[PDB]
Amino acid sequence: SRHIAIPAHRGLITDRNGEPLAVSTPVTTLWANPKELMTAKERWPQLAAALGQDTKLFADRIEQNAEREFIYLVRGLTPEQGEGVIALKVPGVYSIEEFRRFYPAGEVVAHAVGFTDVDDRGREGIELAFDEWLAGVPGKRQVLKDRRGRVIKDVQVTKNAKPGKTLALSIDLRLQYLAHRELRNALLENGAKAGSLVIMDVKTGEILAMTNQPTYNPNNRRNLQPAAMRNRAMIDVFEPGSTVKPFSMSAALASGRWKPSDIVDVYPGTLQIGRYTIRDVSRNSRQLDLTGILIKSSNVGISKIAFDIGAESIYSVMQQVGLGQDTGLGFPGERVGNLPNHRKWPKAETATLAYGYGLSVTAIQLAHAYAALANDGKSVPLSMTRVDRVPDGVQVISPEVASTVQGMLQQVVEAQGGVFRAQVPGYHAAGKSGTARKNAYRSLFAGFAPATDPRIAMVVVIDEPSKAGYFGGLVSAPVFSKVMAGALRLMNVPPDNLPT
Numbered sequence: 001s002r003h004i005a006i007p008a009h010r011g012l013i014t015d016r017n018g019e020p021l022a023v024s025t026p027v028t029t030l031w032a033n034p035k036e037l038m039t040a041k042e043r044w045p046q047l048a049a050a051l052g053q054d055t056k057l058f059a060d061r062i063e064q065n066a067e068r069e070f071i072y073l074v075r076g077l078t079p080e081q082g083e084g085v086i087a088l089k090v091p092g093v094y095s096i097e098e099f100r101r102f103y104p105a106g107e108v109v110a111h112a113v114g115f116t117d118v119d120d121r122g123r124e125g126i127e128l129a130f131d132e133w134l135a136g137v138p139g140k141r142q143v144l145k146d147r148r149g150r151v152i153k154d155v156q157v158t159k160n161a162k163p164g165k166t167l168a169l170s171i172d173l174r175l176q177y178l179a180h181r182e183l184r185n186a187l188l189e190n191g192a193k194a195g196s197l198v199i200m201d202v203k204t205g206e207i208l209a210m211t212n213q214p215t216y217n218p219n220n221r222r223n224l225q226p227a228a229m230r231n232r233a234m235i236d237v238f239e240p241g242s243t244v245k246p247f248s249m250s251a252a253l254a255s256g257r258w259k260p261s262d263i264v265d266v267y268p269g270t271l272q273i274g275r276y277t278i279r280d281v282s283r284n285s286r287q288l289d290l291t292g293i294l295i296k297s298s299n300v301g302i303s304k305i306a307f308d309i310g311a312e313s314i315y316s317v318m319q320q321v322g323l324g325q326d327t328g329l330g331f332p333g334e335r336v337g338n339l340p341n342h343r344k345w346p347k348a349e350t351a352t353l354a355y356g357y358g359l360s361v362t363a364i365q366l367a368h369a370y371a372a373l374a375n376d377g378k379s380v381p382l383s384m385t386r387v388d389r390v391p392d393g394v395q396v397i398s399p400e401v402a403s404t405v406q407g408m409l410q411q412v413v414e415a416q417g418g419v420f421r422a423q424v425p426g427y428h429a430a431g432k433s434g435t436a437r438k439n440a441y442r443s444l445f446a447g448f449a450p451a452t453d454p455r456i457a458m459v460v461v462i463d464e465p466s467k468a469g470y471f472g473g474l475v476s477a478p479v480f481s482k483v484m485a486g487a488l489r490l491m492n493v494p495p496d497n498l499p500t
């Protein structure tokens with residue numbers, strides 16, 4: 001009276017410049033027909049020894065499967081060892097060439113690229129998200145096999161196997177390597193638990209780099225730490241704190257009620273709402289301008305503006321920029337987080353929202369929001385694939401307001417008492433630091449550069465540094481500076497810190 005398969009070649013994954021990130025490698029699979037093996041039991045020990053398996057257990061397996069016409073012996077071998085096994089001429093042993101992925105960049109892009117399971121199907125990262133694109137379609141062979149199950153003849157092919165298609169990611173391996181190295185070093189210098197760093201192109205929406213620590217070698221899937229396998233930029237939610245204040249400020253400027261030169265009274269550094277007390281870390285301020293509120297990261301100052309303008313305006317900005325919103329990336333394990341909403345906002349939620357307490361975002365969401373702000377208020381859809389034709393953006397923040405806030409974030413980095421460690425020598429940079437209290441802290445910095453014409457947005461999240469420095473401007477700001485400094489030269493962006 002059979003229907004055997006023709007493996008499809010799994011589609012190549014490259015970075016944006018064509019560097020291979022996931023490559024299908026030929027392997028040899030060996031299967032057997034126990035009906036033939038039963039006629040050649042004397043050959044089994046030599047075959048067993050060559051496969052690794054135990055002599056008596058392997059013999060027990062065949063004796064147990066004597067009546068079956070197909071069984072698997074082994075599925076992953078090099079074609080070097082596959083040819084060595086084939087040369088034994090054992091009756092009933094047949095071979096099939098399959099594919100197993102190899103990841104040339106390994107740990108550098110393990111979380112973004114992801115990996116494949118035993119069936120060459122996508123399980124994590126891009127491999128999973130674009131499995132349909134990458135997998136291709138297996139084919140159906142037909143062969144004449146007699147009563148013994150011996151493949152005697154080849155009668156027909158029922159379906160032709162179609163290879164998967166190539167996919168170019170948005171990731172720039174040069175930028176990915178830099179962010180990976182700098183984030184790892186920063187975690188070691190701070191003795192931190194974990195970290196994430198994302199770089200995005202503000203003009204096209206492309207994710208140029210996305211790294212997390214700890215990472216793993218997807219070529220070493222020796223069943224490592226599941227926790228280490230977490231793509232934190234997409235699956236871990238956190239309260240963004242001060243890094244969300246530029247969006248609260250954007251709502252204030254768009255309200256018509258506030259200008260940067262306006263003053264807010266933040267004395268004595270605390271603000272009471274019933275049983276709840278809002279508190280600033282530095283409580284030696286009285287009058288602060290809107291830029292000063294961001295520089296000093298005054299929670300009181302941002303709260304007073306929020307009460308004046310209303311939480312609805314702030315909620316609308318944070319929602320439209322994507323905080324706690326679906327990214328559209330289609331990553332099955334990716335987290336949306338949560339953006340609290342109310343019909344009538346009470347005072348406590350208005351203040352906490354404006355200073356980012358009780359909100360849940362991802363590092364990718366936080367970065368995308370900063371990308372929209374940097375892109376004069378236009379939100380460009382997120383993309384993990386190279387973008388050749390840029391989709392239309394949505395104007396989420398008015399150009400004037402976004403431009404004004406950009407200037408304010410530049411003063412945060414450049415002005416007296418600002419986050420000078422986030423300065424990117426040679427360029428004008430802008431950003432906002434954050435420190436979230438979980439005696440353990442999370443240190444954040446989000447920003448963009450060059451301020452004169454933003455090109456790149458970046459988010460640096462370091463979880464639980466355990467050394468002396470713990471402020472976002474101390475722990476995460478230097479990482480932004482180091483990575484931003486390298487990324488601008490790697491993209492050949494002209495330095496904008498020039499003389500007047």
Ligand SMILES: *C(=O)[C@@H](NC(=O)/C(=N\OC)c1csc(N)n1)[C@@H]1N=C(C(=O)O)C(=C)CS1
Nearest residue numbers: 239241242281297357433434435436437472
């Ligand atoms: C801004 O992020 C703000 N941080 C906080 O208010 C919090 N803890 O203070 C240490 C917080 C917000 S949500 C949560 N669970 N905890 C001020 N920002 C910074 C900064 O690093 O930018 C400071 C200079 C100190 S606190």
